[PDB]
């Protein structure tokens, strides 16, 4: 059975007969009365084998007494019935028939090889026109179609001088005659004279084919089939339904059409019938053969009785319901069950409730095995009945097997690996699975009737794999983010919250207790509340410089409940951890603290003990939910009446015709959105600090103990957002479109929505629930694409010896630091020796892990940016090194060799997109954007530091910015970036560049619902290409007559003014142009589409005045749905519609000639005297102002960067940082935590291939893109041995393409495009040596990674050593 690799080739007519064990010459299946195989039928026993084991048809030879005996009477071999699914057959077609995969599957293969159009070949196949195979005199050209009339011309005139024929015979003789060696030479030699792009693309692909066609051992004859193979009977079964009806596969029906038409064709050739009749039959043969192979491809698919089309052979290989995706990359499994899950709050974190009757049926063979050993059952049949009767002795044995024998639990959907965890079973009474509450987060399992699948690890390997890797207690941190997934929620948080939180006096204030046990004594004795301020003696163990724990006793001012909670806390943590009122966010840090200080064992016990006490004290509290708990502020009707009058004001000014519809729409949303903020601020102010209590002194106040508030403040369930809808204001509801409804709901759920308010609410309800069902498939398809590219990637090496990495500046974006350097750089090998500011003593070694200890020192010395070893920068050919990846985020320590990073990386990206599509959608009703970013207020004092800014001073006396991507920093005392903002175009700065500002100062100010076009020069406005009706429109009012002009774009524009560009040209008093300072550019600002203009022609202007106002309608609430397409496009490496232009080579710019508006740039670098020219559109106003020392990758046009242009000009590290930052910004908007290394994993696979420019010393030469890994292994031998070095360029690939580019065709055909992959592999004669995981999962082998890593490399040394 065992083997090395699998190969695909075309089937020779000779090869098809080798597989066959007899020819099916009849369409008959079975005799209707004596149900047996028919004489040379589709289900023939003489050809495919006997129905019973070792039994001929007539029944002359039975059983193994006659071993290898072929009966003389019926003609049937006495062998196993197994031979019926294995032996194939054949049909000798009277006439050749083209294979549809080597005809329709574009590129046509048969057409690409003949250089003859597919249309032209089909005319020959359906007998419309003849084709010249070999015109003796070159009067008749080869491969020239002759019509039926044009065939009659040559017939009388020439006759034998030409051999033009028709049908598949003609195309096969045409493929026979062609010489691959002679035509290939000619294509090579005749490409030299022209040398273009599409010739060199198509002629080089033809050379690659002709060369691969020879070396593959394939012949172009085999494109056309002379022989048709038959599938074995058992694989297309005719089996009896329980009742007398039978059932058959759709292949039997397609085989019968082919045999009937082939047999009839032979008879019509015997009858020497006219060709008209013979042709019709040849057409029908082609149709039946093409329908057998791929039904729905050439024409209308042949439907059977049901009206649906008959399922073809190709169909059982292709797509989802194909063998690959459904019966091979995934399977039905023995020793599996499922049931409705329920809580098990008594259970430990390593346990799960497994029902009696489930476990009985699950562990059947292990019980029969113990029953023989204990001597209770003689045979297995005896043991079977003992278990079926459910004897008392059997329950005791079942209990014996299950101890220390884990079970796997799974939930749909399996988004990430924690969707399967291992537990030790606890047998229970009922029929329902009991799941541990803490792992509920990983499964996303709520008990409202979820079902979870059970799997028994049978083998000892599997019991150890379950216990060592997949056990719940082993899997605490998330592999996506270095943070615990096992984190208490719901009642547990609420209980520890209620315990720790303090209250005014209460029972027994200012007491003094001996220990945490006397605190439990006064609480259970009923002399103290959990909230009483008390002095308590507590002894905290803090860890020393060495491993030893140091004990420290001290009086602590904490409540009774806080003292009781310290009892759960292990020795190692400070008492400071339980001294605060604990919520969900703090409790998560408790187990993260405990994990890094103590270990795994303490955390598992601590996490449990937290769970137990948390539930218990939640129950003690009697926290509840009443209608009075939903307090509404008394001043709500006051806020609404004010806000109603404000909105009525803009609507009354709209009737006057002062404000437009779009302006009112955006302006009204801002008033209501701030009113919802006002009501909610009043609600949370009248809710949070509402408790005013009388202490033993006089009177004071504290946080309210309103039951709903506690539930949202603790973070147990709900948030302030939900409480708005309950007590405050419901808010702006979202349209199904995504845009915001202008009328928001004033009322809340306590007050009740009226008939219309509900009807408005439903718009947003259905759209959310709609995305939960529909849009999950776009997101889940991303998970799939990401896995297929990263699949094969595994840690292969300990240390690559590379010195490279990506420089990780801290993500300080939008005032507060969004992600510190510490978080981003934690658990990563220090690429370069990064010391302290004073470069005179190294602080951190080059090859060392970044532990939280080292990360704390980075904050002490204030390391700003750190170069860090990345996955992308690894120089490992085989996979990746342990150092480049760094820490396993799930384990908190160095990653192991053998662990499969590709799949872990794809899952971590794919999961939150997929699950969040179902999260804030079922939960979502209301819209809540606040995109009203009017002004930046700086918060700390600093010097103003702008970058990538070019501003100009206006008439008012204000620094107006005339650059798109302007950034504003906030520099402290010593000189480091604390805050960062995005200042937009046409914004008014308070203070210019370098000036000091105070804290709480408006440093910038602008209008958000408008993108102004601001001038750089003063003078008068001129109208150019601004014809009324063609390019712009006009609308006037009354008495005086103020008219506004609105620029039409290609949508609202006629064919007349299409190539006209509308622009407001600047001129002086005389009428001439005004040059922009220090440039030869006459001043001309191009207005885009839908640009509203107030100033008409002939108006005086200063510099800094707004010429036109481009509307900025973006009222869509950004959920996962609007950001995921961005993420998909980034990973798929798509250029945008308007890519920004970048400088290719460093050197001195000179502007050049022009094409009727379109610019040219003949840039002549200092070193490279040879020039580089490139065309630029008219309308793109350039950032660079010509004659300047421009370097590689300098933004010339403003706008979005193609990731191709980044990698091409600024290397790998630039494009990696572009993808990581751009993708991660989308997930950061939604609060999703994904480490950069997981994106970096997939980026590495995107940077797989590379195009070879200069010739090598192998067979790369020019144009042939090969994998990076392969060309480097050649370069290692070339640098030492010598000969021609191969110059290269790394190319970027999208996911869907990088997956199909892999050499493993089995990986490619299992992904997508199954029909195309198999044909391109068949013609190239490719051999897949089963490299990656998909390949071994298919063949049913051990994975070449994880536990099997060690085993696969052991086979690989057997292969090397002899």
């Amino acid at each position: 059975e065992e083997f090395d690799a699998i190969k695909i080739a075309l089937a020779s007519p000779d090869m098809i007969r080798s597989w066959s064990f007899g020819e099916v010459k009849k369409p008959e299946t079975i005799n209707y009365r004596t149900f047996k195989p028919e004489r040379d039928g589709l289900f023939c026993a003489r050809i495919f084998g006997p129905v019973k084991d070792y039994e001929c048809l007539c029944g002359k030879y039975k059983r193994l007494k006659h071993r290898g005996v072929i009966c003389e009477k019926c003609g049937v071999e006495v062998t196993q019935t197994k031979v019926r699914r294995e032996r194939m057959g054949h049909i000798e077609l009277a006439s050749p028939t083209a294979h549809i995969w080597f005809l329709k599957s574009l590129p046509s293969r048969i057409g690409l090889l003949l250089d003859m159009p597919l249309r032209d070949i089909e005319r020959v196949l359906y007998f419309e026109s003849y084709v010249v195979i070999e015109g003796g005199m070159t009067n008749l050209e080869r491969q020239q179609i002759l019509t039926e009339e044009q065939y009659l011309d040559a017939l009388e005139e020439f006759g034998d001088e030409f051999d033009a024929k028709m049908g598949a015979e003609a195309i096969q003789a045409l493929l026979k005659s062609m010489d691959l060696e002679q035509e290939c030479e000619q294509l090579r030699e005749e490409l030299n004279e022209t040398n273009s792009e599409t010739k060199r693309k198509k002629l080089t692909k033809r050379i690659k084919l002709l060369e691969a066609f020879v070396q593959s051992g394939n012949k172009p004859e085999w494109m056309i089939l002379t022989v048709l193979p038959v599938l074995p009977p058992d694989l297309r079964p005719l089996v009896p339904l329980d009742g007398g009806r039978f059932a058959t596969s759709d292949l039997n029906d397609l085989y019968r059409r082919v045999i009937n038409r082939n047999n009839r064709l032979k008879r019509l050739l015997d009858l020497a019938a006219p060709d008209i009749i013979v042709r019709n039959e040849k057409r029908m043969l082609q149709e039946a053969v093409d329908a057998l192979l791929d039904n729905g491809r050439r024409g209308r698919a042949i439907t059977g009785s049901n009206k649906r089309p008959l399922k073809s052979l190709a169909d059982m290989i292709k797509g989802k319901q194909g063998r690959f995706r459904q019966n091979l990359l995934g399977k039905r499994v023995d020793y599996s069950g499922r049931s409705v899950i329920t809580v098990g709050p008594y259970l430990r974190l390593h346990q799960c409730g497994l029902p009696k009757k489930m476990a009985l049926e699950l562990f059947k063979p292990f019980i029969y095995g113990k029953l023989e050993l204990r001597g209770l059952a003689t045979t297995i049949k005896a043991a079977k009945k003992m278990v079926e009767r459910e004897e008392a002795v059997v329950w005791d044995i079942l209990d014996e097997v299950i101890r220390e024998h884990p079970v796997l639990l799974n939930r749909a959907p399996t988004l990430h690996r924690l969707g399967i965890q291992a537990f030790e079973p606890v047998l229970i009474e009922g029929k329902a699975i009991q799941l541990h509450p803490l792992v509920c987060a990983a499964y996303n399992a709520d008990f409202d009737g979820d079902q979870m699948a059970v799997h028994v690890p049978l083998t000892l390997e599997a019991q150890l794999e379950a216990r060592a890797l997949m056990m719940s207690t082993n899997n605490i941190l998330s592999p996506a983010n270095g943070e615990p997934i096992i984190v208490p929620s719901q009642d547990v948080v609420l209980g520890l919250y209620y315990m720790t939180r303090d209250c005014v006096n209460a029972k027994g204030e200012g007491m003094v207790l001996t220990g945490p046990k006397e605190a439990e004594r006064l609480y259970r004795s009923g002399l103290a509340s959990l909230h009483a301020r008390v002095k308590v003696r507590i002894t905290e163990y803090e860890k020393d410089a060495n491993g030893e724990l140091v004990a420290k006793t001290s009086l602590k001012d904490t409540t009774v409940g806080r003292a009781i909670l310290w009892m759960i806390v292990p020795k190692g943590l400070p008492y400071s951890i339980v001294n605060q009122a604990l919520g969900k966010k703090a409790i998560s840090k408790m187990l993260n603290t405990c994990y890094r200080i103590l270990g795994l064992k303490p955390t598992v016990i601590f996490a449990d003990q937290i769970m137990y006490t948390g539930f218990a004290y939640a129950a003690r509290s009697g926290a509840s939910v009443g209608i009075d708990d939903m307090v509404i502020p008394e001043k709500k009707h006051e806020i609404i009446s004010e806000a109603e009058a404000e909105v009525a004001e803009i609507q009354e000014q709209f009737q006057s015709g002062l404000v437009t519809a779009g302006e009112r729409y955006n302006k009204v949303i801002d008033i209501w959105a701030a009113a919802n903020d006002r009501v909610s601020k009043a609600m949370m102010d009248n809710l949070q600090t509402e408790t005013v209590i009388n202490r033993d002194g006089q009177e004071e106040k504290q946080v309210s103990f309103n039951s709903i508030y506690m539930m949202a403040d603790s973070g147990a369930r709900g948030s302030a957002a939900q409480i708005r809808q309950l007590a405050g204001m419901r808010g702006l509801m979202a349209k199904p479109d995504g845009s915001i409804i202008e009328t928001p709901i004033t009322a809340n759920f306590r007050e009740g929505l009226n008939v219309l308010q509900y009807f408005i609410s439903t718009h947003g309800a259905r759209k959310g629930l709609a995305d939960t069902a529909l849009k999950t498939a776009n997101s889940g398809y991303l998970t799939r694409r990401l896995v297929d590219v990263a699949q094969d990637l595994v840690v292969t090496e300990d240390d690559c010896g590379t010195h490279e990495g990506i420089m990780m500046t801290p993500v300080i974006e939008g005032g507060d630091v969004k992600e510190p350097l510490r978080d981003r750089v934690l658990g990563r090998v220090t690429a370069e020796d990064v010391l302290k500011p004073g470069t005179a003593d190294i602080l951190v070694p080059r090859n060392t892990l970044l532990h939280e200890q080292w990360c704390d020192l980075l904050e002490e010395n204030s390391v700003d940016a750190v170069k860090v070893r990345s996955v992308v920068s690894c120089d490992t050919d085989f996979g990746v090194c342990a150092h480049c990846y760094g820490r396993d985020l799930a384990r908190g320590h160095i990653i192991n060799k053998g662990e499969a990073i590709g799949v872990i990386a794809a899952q971590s990206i794919g999961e939150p997109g997929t699950q969040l599509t179902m999260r804030t959608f079922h939960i979502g009703g209301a819209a809540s954007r606040a995109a009203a970013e009017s002004s930046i207020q700086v918060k700390n004092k600093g010097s103003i530091k702008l970058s990538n800014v070019k501003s100009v001073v206006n008439s008012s006396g204000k620094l107006v910015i005339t650059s798109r991507n302007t950034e504003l920093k906030l520099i402290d005392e010593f000189g480091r970036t604390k805050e960062s903002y995005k200042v937009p175009y046409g914004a008014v700065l308070a203070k210019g560049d370098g000036e000091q500002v105070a804290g709480g100062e408006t440093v910038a100010n602008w209008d958000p619902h408008t993108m102004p076009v601001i001038t750089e020069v003063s003078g008068f406005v001129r109208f150019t290409d601004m014809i009324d009706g063609q390019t712009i429109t006009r609308q006037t009012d009354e008495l005086t007559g103020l008219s506004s002009l609105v620029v039409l774009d290609s949508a609202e524009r006629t064919a007349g003014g299409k190539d006209l560009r509308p622009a407001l040209k600047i001129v002086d008093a005389q009428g001439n142009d005004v040059l922009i300072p220090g440039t030869d550019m006459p001043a001309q600002y191009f207005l885009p589409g839908k640009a509203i203009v107030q100033l008409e022609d002939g108006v005086q202007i200063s510099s800094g005045d707004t010429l036109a106002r481009i509307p900025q309608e973006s009222g869509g609430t950004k959920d996962i749905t609007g950001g995921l397409p961005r993420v998909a496009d980034l990973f798929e490496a798509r250029r945008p519609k308007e890519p920004a232009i970048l400088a290719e080579i460093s050197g001195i710019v000179s502007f050049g000639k022009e094409t009727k508006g379109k610019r040219r740039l003949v840039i002549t670098p200092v070193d490279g005297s040879d020039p580089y020219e490139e065309m630029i559109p008219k309308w793109r106003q350039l950032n660079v102002f010509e004659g300047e020392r421009v370097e590689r990758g300098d933004v010339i046009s403003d706008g979005p960067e193609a990731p191709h242009d980044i990698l091409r000009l600024r290397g790998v590290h630039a494009v990696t940082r572009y993808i990581v930052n751009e993708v991660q910004d989308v997930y950061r908007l939604q609060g999703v935590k994904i480490n950069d290394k997981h994106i970096e994993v997939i980026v590495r696979q995107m940077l797989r291939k590379a195009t070879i420019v200069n010739a090598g010393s192998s067979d790369f030469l020019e144009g042939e893109q090969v994998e990076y890994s392969r060309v480097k292994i050649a370069n290692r031998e070339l640098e030492a041995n010598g000969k021609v070095g191969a110059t290269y360029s790394r190319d970027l690939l999208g996911i869907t393409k990088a997956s199909l580019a892999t050499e493993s065709f089995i990986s490619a055909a299992s992904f997508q495009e199954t029909t195309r992959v198999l044909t391109e592999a068949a013609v190239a004669g490719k051999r897949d040596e089963l490299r990656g995981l998909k390949e071994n999962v298919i063949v049913g082998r051990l994975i070449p990674a994880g536990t099997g890593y060690a085993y696969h490399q052991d086979r690989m040394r057997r292969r090397a050593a002899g």
Binding site: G752, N754, V755, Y758, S761, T762, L769, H922, G925
Partner: protein, 49 residues
């Protein structure tokens, strides 16, 4: 004087399933949907209470 017609009943925008939800006015549309759909799945008991 500008009013031409009026809704006949308070219940007319809702269905038969949703009419049987008490205090529907204080329920979210998302939960109200599932509630009306599960009310249909409610198996009748031994004693009709």
């Amino acid at each position: 004087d500008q009013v031409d017609y009026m809704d006949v009943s308070t219940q007319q925008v809702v269905s038969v399933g949703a009419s049987l939800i008490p205090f529907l006015e204080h329920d979210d549309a998302n939960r109200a949907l599932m509630g009306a759909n599960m009310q249909r799945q409610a198996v009748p008991t031994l004693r009709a209470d």
